[PDB]
PDB file of N, CA and C in Angstrom:
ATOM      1  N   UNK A   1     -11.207  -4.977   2.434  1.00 34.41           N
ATOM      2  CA  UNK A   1     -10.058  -4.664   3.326  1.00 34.41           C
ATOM      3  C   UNK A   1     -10.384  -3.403   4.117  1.00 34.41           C
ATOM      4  N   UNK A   2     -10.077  -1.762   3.613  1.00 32.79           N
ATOM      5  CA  UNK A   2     -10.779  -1.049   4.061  1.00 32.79           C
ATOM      6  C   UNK A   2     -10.111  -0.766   5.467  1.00 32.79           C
ATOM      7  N   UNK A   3     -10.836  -0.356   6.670  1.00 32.10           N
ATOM      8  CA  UNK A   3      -9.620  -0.205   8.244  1.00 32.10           C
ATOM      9  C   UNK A   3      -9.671  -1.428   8.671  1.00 32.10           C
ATOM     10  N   UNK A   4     -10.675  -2.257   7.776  1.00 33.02           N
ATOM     11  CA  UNK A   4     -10.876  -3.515   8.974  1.00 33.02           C
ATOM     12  C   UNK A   4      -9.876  -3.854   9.291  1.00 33.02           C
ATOM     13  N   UNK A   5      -8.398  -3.850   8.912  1.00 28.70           N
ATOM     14  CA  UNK A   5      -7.695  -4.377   9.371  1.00 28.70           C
ATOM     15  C   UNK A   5      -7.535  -3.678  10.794  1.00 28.70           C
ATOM     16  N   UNK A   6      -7.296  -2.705  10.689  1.00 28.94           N
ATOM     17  CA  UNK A   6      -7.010  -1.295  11.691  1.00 28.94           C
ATOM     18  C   UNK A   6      -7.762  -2.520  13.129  1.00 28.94           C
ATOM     19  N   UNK A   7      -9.085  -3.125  12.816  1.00 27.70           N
ATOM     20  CA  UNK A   7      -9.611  -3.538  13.384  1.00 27.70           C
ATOM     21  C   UNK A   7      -9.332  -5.257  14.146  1.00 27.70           C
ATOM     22  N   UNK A   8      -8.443  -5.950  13.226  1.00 28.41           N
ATOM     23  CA  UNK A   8      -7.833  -6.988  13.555  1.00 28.41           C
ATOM     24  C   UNK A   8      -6.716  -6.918  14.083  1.00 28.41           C
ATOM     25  N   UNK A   9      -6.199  -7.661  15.011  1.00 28.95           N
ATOM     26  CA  UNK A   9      -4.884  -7.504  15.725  1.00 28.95           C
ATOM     27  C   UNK A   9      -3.835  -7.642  15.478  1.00 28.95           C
ATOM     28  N   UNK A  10      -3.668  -8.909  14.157  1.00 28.93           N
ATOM     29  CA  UNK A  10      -3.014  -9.360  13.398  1.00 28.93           C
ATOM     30  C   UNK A  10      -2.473  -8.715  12.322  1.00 28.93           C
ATOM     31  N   UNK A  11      -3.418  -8.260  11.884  1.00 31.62           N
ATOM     32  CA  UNK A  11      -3.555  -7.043  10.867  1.00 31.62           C
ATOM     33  C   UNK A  11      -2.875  -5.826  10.753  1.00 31.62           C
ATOM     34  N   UNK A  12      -3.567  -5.010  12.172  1.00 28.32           N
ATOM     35  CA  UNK A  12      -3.059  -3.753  11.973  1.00 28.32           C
ATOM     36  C   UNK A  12      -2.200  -4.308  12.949  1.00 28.32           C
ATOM     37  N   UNK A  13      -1.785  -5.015  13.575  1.00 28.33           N
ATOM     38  CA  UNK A  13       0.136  -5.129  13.983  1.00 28.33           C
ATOM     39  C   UNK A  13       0.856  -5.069  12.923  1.00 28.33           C
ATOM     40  N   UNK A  14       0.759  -5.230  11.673  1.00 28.73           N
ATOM     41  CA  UNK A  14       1.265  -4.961  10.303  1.00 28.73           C
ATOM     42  C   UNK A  14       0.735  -3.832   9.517  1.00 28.73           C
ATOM     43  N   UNK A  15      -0.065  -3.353  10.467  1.00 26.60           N
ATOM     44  CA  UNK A  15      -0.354  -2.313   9.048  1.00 26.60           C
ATOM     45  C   UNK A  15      -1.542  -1.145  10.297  1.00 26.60           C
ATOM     46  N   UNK A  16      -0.456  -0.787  11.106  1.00 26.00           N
ATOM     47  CA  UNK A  16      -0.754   0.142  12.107  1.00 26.00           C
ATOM     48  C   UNK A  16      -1.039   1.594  11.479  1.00 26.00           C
ATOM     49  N   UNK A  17       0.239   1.821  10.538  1.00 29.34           N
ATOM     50  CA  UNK A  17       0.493   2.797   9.651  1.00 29.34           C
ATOM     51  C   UNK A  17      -1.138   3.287   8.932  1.00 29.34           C
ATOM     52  N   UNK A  18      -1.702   1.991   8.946  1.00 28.18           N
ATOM     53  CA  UNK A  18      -3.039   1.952   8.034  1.00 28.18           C
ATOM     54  C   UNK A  18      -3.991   3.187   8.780  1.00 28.18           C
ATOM     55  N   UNK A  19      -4.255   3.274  10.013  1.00 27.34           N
ATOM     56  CA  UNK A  19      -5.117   3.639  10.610  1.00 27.34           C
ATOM     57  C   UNK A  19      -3.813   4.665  11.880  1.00 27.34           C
TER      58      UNK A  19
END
């Protein structure tokens, strides 16, 4: 998992907070 999300659009549209 890790920022990759930060890196998906899908993702960090949910989890912006992340990064």
């Amino acid at each position: 998992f890790n920022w990759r999300c930060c890196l998906i659009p899908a993702c960090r549209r949910n989890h912006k907070k992340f990064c």
